[PDB]
Structure 1
Amino acid sequence: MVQRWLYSTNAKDIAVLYFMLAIFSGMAGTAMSLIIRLELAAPGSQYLHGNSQLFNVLVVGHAVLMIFFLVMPALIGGFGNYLLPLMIGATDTAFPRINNIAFWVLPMGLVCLVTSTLVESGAGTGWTVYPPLSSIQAHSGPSVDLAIFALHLTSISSLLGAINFIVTTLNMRTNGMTMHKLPLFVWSIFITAFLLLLSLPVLSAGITMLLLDRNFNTSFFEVSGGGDPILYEHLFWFFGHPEVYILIIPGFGIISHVVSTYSKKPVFGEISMVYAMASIGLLGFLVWSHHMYIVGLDADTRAYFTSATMIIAIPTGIKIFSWLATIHGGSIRLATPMLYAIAFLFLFTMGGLTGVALANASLDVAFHDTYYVVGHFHYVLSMGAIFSLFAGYYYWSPQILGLNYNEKLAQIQFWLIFIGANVIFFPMHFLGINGMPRRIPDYPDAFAGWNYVASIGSFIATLSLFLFIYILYDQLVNGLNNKVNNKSVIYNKAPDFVESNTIFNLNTVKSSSIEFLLTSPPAVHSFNTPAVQS
């Protein structure tokens, strides 16, 4: 099986491997999140006997893991390399060895990340790796070096995945797929590949500059030598906000592809949807100065950047209102992917309104590095990543794997993670609105009630994840019995109202893309004949 998996070239096996690494690293990220909430549960360092360096190490570990090693290799990696060759009807992705090196350079990033945590001191700097905190004076030991190499390896993997995706969808469209007729998730992967290609070089440049300052006695950001850390702040957020819009774009694609097939009607204005995706993508670049309104930017600079980062809420609102039109006037067959898309809609709307309250520079003077920015970003990022990920998994898993999850377990998993996520990230709005600073292991002795109910909510969400990995085992060893007996939902799109049962039995799958017509778990190199389209 070494020939099938280690030497692998096909898109489906690499995508399954991407997904397995995503579940592993996401498990490690939520365990780091669990210890973060455990030490944060009561005022004082209860569990970790002092040692705030371990708390900052676990903050950067949680951050780097659940951005670069769960959401990126999940959405770009697994669902990308499984559906972008298949939804366009390509046989396999072009440049396949590049794709295999992208996936297999990810766990080397994971190995050097866990070695960065394990090695002598520990990277206690946060996922913003700001100097002089990341200088050699405030951080000896090669821990920041190994975590920076982990960030570089993930940059290499996401860059190779993005260039592979953009050439595979720019050249291997099948016999009818003009660019106006592309599926919506394909457009989302194309847009985020374009954004990755136009963003990740600046990240690699800035992190190499930080390494040259840290180990080679140069003066880029250290003040003793003329440099300034404002240059690292500019470069890192010029990467960082395109990074998080890259995290949110295939979420929009997967949610649109769930809604437009569980509401049995096509998406409202696919051209307006892809222009909204292009607008939010290109406007993720020019608002990169919103992360440092505190830093001392001028009056005209801040007043321009707040107007841009509040005008970026127009295309996202176009997407939300088009989604509400797509659910309006359908037949909302409330299965688990539709449940995840509904709660994604509501929760992402609440988080986006928190962000647009955060965006004003006259209001950011009382919110930056409080827990209000933590509320906005954990809401938008956690919901529009994890909820979209669960929607994609429960939406494509009988198609891409060929088994069947239990249905009642899937719905209680959704309800547990929804009430857990709501009850954990709603109090952080209050803790930020009354001034609790970021990245504290010990806190003022007034915040104990909300920082206790937040640690209740983390336990609820971790119980939802343990239920999820029970569902995974049940799907893997009882999928055929779930197909036979009445547990799962076999036919995803319901029969329409005047449609009979025999007619539906001959016409079972009515999708708007290829892959739902593909066989359960699909043939290894399908499209022996090129798939033609009108």
Structure 2
Amino acid sequence: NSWWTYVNRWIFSTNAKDIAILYLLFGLVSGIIGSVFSFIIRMELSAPGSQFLSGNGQLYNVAISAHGILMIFFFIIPALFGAFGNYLVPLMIGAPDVAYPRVNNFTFWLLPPALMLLLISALTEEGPGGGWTVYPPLSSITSHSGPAIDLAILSLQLTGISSTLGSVNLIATMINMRAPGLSLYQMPLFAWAIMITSILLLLTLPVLAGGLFMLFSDRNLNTSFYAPEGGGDPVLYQHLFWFFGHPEVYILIMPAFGVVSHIIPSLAHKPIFGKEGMLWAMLSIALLGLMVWSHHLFTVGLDVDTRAYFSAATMVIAIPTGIKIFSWLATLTGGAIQWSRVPMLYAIGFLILFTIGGLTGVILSNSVLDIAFHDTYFVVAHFHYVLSMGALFGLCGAYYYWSPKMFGLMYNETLASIQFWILFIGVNIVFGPQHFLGLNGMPRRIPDYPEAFVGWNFVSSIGSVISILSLFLFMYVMYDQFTSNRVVKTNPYLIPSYFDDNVIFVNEKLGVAQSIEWLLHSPVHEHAFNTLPTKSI
């Protein structure tokens, strides 16, 4: 009877390896639903006027809000921040298991009920209509009558508290379970980044918890927390929300930084340039990304001195990121490059998209400049061309780079490269025309638009269609990899140097890697690190 063994190995199991795979699967099943939502909303705006629908604006609001919320909180955060950390951080720190296995098991299972209740909420008579950033007066019982947005508030609350509970054990694990002789300074860059995101998320999210609960209480207890007649100021709500929203994207994108800084050296066979400078600049970014929050409130009408104070500091964020990009550029040159490898392809494509997105972000960090682009399609282009080009590319590269370690299989290089090229072209021709659409002075979140905009929407729709074929090809390649029984060696990314004999290398050179995870067999043991690896003190 393997059924008891089945459910003990999967449900009543607390091993880190058996949980990250479920993290990836949950991320995938959220991402497919989100991609179809995005496809339907982009197909709505193919041409001006009501199209495929009876002009249902509330339905369009539900669609955009659902796409945003589910793809920002059910696709990227749970499938990148903790999915590739809980599996891999114990391997690089020198520990056999996380500090608290039971909380690690608990954190994962708070998400499925969140997804079901979010779907139920979206399946109400009205559904959430405040968008990704819901606002009190719109959310007020005056507009919505029913259990539509309350469940969305609850889902955000519980997902946030689960993510906070899913990050308490990680910090303890990587602060106390360090290897003998592994100073915190000598820690690998990826775990450095993941710990920075963990501490930032835990420090900031409680504020969201409290603010969201007090805002939600307005619908039931009739509190005057944000009522215009009750003495409440919604600018307080905006300040509370954007004390969280601004660093959230950084804590989402830092794992991409770490995975890129890990992918570049091994496939380049060259050590990373300036590790200490890079990590200290990233620490400066982490500390800096908190005191700037009011760039999302530029046209609300705050005072001149506050605007200058919180707009001047927006620029200084660029300097460490530019230093990081320059360091990666320097690392790429000189050393060998295998440009044909899929992780190398994704890492190379990440840099140009991230830097152009950063340039777009530095475009609109001025109160003098934001007035022409605030709440228009230009900010949509900026934030999309940063998010879906950095976090999605990092996730794809991490999957294609560490998949043999998760399972022990080989994918098809041809199909993977074709998928990468198709996805790159589609996402480049999707968010391209939106730059012009927002540069003309046309707002966002409008199912209908003035007639002199049809061409760029038509150009975007074809790329939106192409992205769906990219998704189909990725699904096919994942299935093929899962059922191809293609074996993998211990360290598939280790090759003999220019002066290694074919008989000396095979017998006196195997079992060497830049990181610990490649030392063990690709399907890792349940109980690894029986004895602690000891380095040079």
Which TM-score band (shorter chain)? over 0.9
**Aligned position for 2:287:** 282
Q: Contact conserved, 2:16 with 2:87, CA < 8 A, in 1? A: yes
**Distance in structure 2 (CA, Å) of the matches to 1:531 and 1:23:** 35
Residue 392 (structure 1) aligned with residue 393 (structure 2): no
Give the secondary-structure state (helix, strand or coil) at the position aligned to 1:70. helix
Q: Contact conserved, 2:278 with 2:324, CA < 8 A, in 1? A: yes
Query: Quick one: which amino acid aligns to residue 519 of structure 1?
Result: H
Pairing partner for 2:518 from 507, 516, 519 = 516
**Distance in structure 1 (CA, Å) of the matches to 2:511 and 2:372:** 53
Could you state the TM-score of these two structures normalised by the residue count of structure 1? 0.96
Does the C-alpha gap of structure 1 residues 33 and 505 become closer, same or farther in structure 2, counting only changes over 3 Å?
farther
1:190-269 residue pairs with structure 2 within 5 A? 190-269=195-274
Give the secondary-structure state (helix, strand or coil) at the position aligned to 2:231. coil
Residue 451 (structure 1) shift: 1.0
Residue 337 (structure 1) aligned with residue 343 (structure 2): yes
Residue 377 (structure 1) shift: 0.4
Query: Quick one: which amino acid aligns to residue 301 of structure 1?
Result: T
**Aligned position for 2:59:** 54
Give the secondary-structure state (helix, strand or coil) at the position aligned to 1:438. coil
Residue 218 (structure 1) shift: 0.4
**Aligned position for 1:349:** 355
**Distance in structure 2 (CA, Å) of the matches to 1:120 and 1:509:** 61
Percentage of identical aligned residues: 61
Pairing partner for 1:416 from 416, 422, 438 = 422
**Aligned position for 1:325:** 330
**Distance in structure 1 (CA, Å) of the matches to 2:98 and 2:331:** 31
Q: Contact conserved, 1:264 with 1:493, CA < 8 A, in 2? A: no
* CA deviations over 1:352-385 (Å, ceiling 9, x no partner): 0000011111100011111110111001111111
Give the secondary-structure state (helix, strand or coil) at the position aligned to 2:252. helix
**RMSD of aligned Cα (Å):** 1.6
Query: Quick one: which amino acid aligns to residue 160 of structure 1?
Result: L
Residue 114 (structure 1) aligned with residue 119 (structure 2): yes
Q: Contact conserved, 1:88 with 1:173, CA < 8 A, in 2? A: yes
Query: Quick one: which amino acid aligns to residue 513 of structure 1?
Result: S
1:67-86 residue pairs with structure 2 within 5 A? 67-86=72-91
Q: Contact conserved, 1:405 with 1:479, CA < 8 A, in 2? A: no
Give the secondary-structure state (helix, strand or coil) at the position aligned to 1:10. coil
Residue 345 (structure 1) shift: 0.4
* CA deviations over 1:281-306 (Å, ceiling 9, x no partner): 12111111111101112111111111
Query: Quick one: which amino acid aligns to residue 261 of structure 1?
Result: S
Give the secondary-structure state (helix, strand or coil) at the position aligned to 2:141. coil
Query: Quick one: which amino acid aligns to residue 530 of structure 2?
Result: N
**Distance in structure 1 (CA, Å) of the matches to 2:410 and 2:47:** 42
Q: Contact conserved, 2:491 with 2:513, CA < 8 A, in 1? A: no
**Distance in structure 2 (CA, Å) of the matches to 1:269 and 1:373:** 33
**Aligned position for 1:365:** 371
* CA deviations over 1:147-180 (Å, ceiling 9, x no partner): 1111112101210122121111111112221111
Q: Contact conserved, 1:370 with 1:437, CA < 8 A, in 2? A: yes
**Distance in structure 1 (CA, Å) of the matches to 2:504 and 2:119:** 55
1:51-200 residue pairs with structure 2 within 5 A? 51-200=56-205
Residue 415 (structure 1) shift: 0.5
Q: Contact conserved, 1:242 with 1:285, CA < 8 A, in 2? A: yes
Query: Quick one: which amino acid aligns to residue 432 of structure 2?
Result: F
Give the secondary-structure state (helix, strand or coil) at the position aligned to 2:137. coil
Residue 47 (structure 1) shift: 1.7
Q: Contact conserved, 1:162 with 1:192, CA < 8 A, in 2? A: no
Pairing partner for 1:447 from 443, 453, 472 = 453
Give the secondary-structure state (helix, strand or coil) at the position aligned to 1:495. coil
Residue 460 (structure 1) shift: 1.3
**Distance in structure 2 (CA, Å) of the matches to 1:508 and 1:432:** 55
**Aligned position for 2:3:** none
Query: Quick one: which amino acid aligns to residue 495 of structure 1?
Result: P
Query: Quick one: which amino acid aligns to residue 401 of structure 2?
Result: Y
Q: Contact conserved, 1:19 with 1:77, CA < 8 A, in 2? A: no
Residue 226 (structure 1) shift: 0.9
Could you state the TM-score of these two structures normalised by the residue count of structure 2? 0.96
* CA deviations over 1:465-499 (Å, ceiling 9, x no partner): 1111111101000042x759xxxx98324432223
**Number of positions where the alignment pairs a residue of Structure 1 with one of Structure 2:** 529
* CA deviations over 1:236-286 (Å, ceiling 9, x no partner): 111101111111111100111001211111111111121122111121111
Give the secondary-structure state (helix, strand or coil) at the position aligned to 1:363. helix
**Aligned position for 1:529:** 531
**Aligned position for 1:495:** 496
**Distance in structure 1 (CA, Å) of the matches to 2:510 and 2:311:** 50
Query: Quick one: which amino acid aligns to residue 125 of structure 1?
Result: G
Moved more, 335-344 or 496-505: 496-505
Pairing partner for 1:464 from 449, 466, 470 = 470
Give the secondary-structure state (helix, strand or coil) at the position aligned to 1:179. coil
* CA deviations over 1:375-406 (Å, ceiling 9, x no partner): 11001111111100001001100122110111
**Distance in structure 2 (CA, Å) of the matches to 1:464 and 1:26:** 13
**Aligned position for 1:375:** 381
* CA deviations over 1:195-227 (Å, ceiling 9, x no partner): 001110111111101111122100111212110
**Distance in structure 2 (CA, Å) of the matches to 1:102 and 1:374:** 32
Residue 504 (structure 1) shift: 3.9
**Distance in structure 1 (CA, Å) of the matches to 2:208 and 2:27:** 22
Does the C-alpha gap of structure 1 residues 501 and 210 become closer, same or farther in structure 2, counting only changes over 3 Å?
farther
**Distance in structure 2 (CA, Å) of the matches to 1:491 and 1:181:** 25
Query: Quick one: which amino acid aligns to residue 338 of structure 2?
Result: R
